[PDB]
Structure 1
Amino acid sequence: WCCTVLSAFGVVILSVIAHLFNTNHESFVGSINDPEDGPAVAHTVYLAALVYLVFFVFCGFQV
């Protein structure tokens, strides 16, 4: 119940991170110090978002 909000927030954040990585913003893969494998960053963030959404579904309760 309580963890559902956390899972949803994590899913949203990971989705935003994946979008940024795919777009290759100045942050994240944009920085040279950070790994430049932008597609890899987007893939990792998207899969993390999928896991977070699965956690959201699991925590979802009806009554």
Structure 2
Amino acid sequence: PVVSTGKAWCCTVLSAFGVVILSVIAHLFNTNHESFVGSINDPEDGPAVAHTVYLAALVYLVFFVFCGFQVYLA
């Protein structure tokens, strides 16, 4: 496996905060918010960049369930 004591927790905590933060960032790019899309030097397309953040939320969910079972071995 992995070291599963200092390396499994270090990835499960990072992935647990990776799902929660990127989900609300993708939600605030889905609806126009004037803080995430309000500047002339800023992403334009709106809910198109919510897709590429939502996929990173799913990748972090994959890491979360993959490293959450590896501490469940003991």
Q: Give the TM-score of the pair, scaled to structure 2.
A: 0.73
CA deviation profile, 1:18-52 (whole Å, cap 9, x unmatched): 10001111122232211111111111111110111
SS of structure 1 residue aligned to 2:26? helix
Query: Is the radius of gyration larger for structure 1 or structure 2?
Result: 2
More moved, 3-12 vs 24-33: 24-33
Instruction: Give, in angstroms, the shift of residue 6 of structure 1.
Output: 0.5
Ranges in structure 2 where 5+ consecutive residues have no aligned partner: 1-8
Aligned length: 63
Answer yes or no: is the 8 Å Cα contact 2:31–2:47 preserved in 1: no
1:17 alignment partner, one of 16, 20, 25: 25
Runs of 4+ in 1 over 4 A off after TM superposition: none
- CA RMSD, 1 decimal: 1.6
Q: Which has the higher helix share?
A: 1
Q: Give the TM-score of the pair, scaled to structure 1.
A: 0.84
Instruction: Give, in angstroms, the shift of residue 62 of structure 1.
Output: 6.4
% identity of equivalent residues: 100
Ranges in structure 1 where 5+ consecutive residues have no aligned partner: none
More moved, 44-53 vs 27-36: 27-36
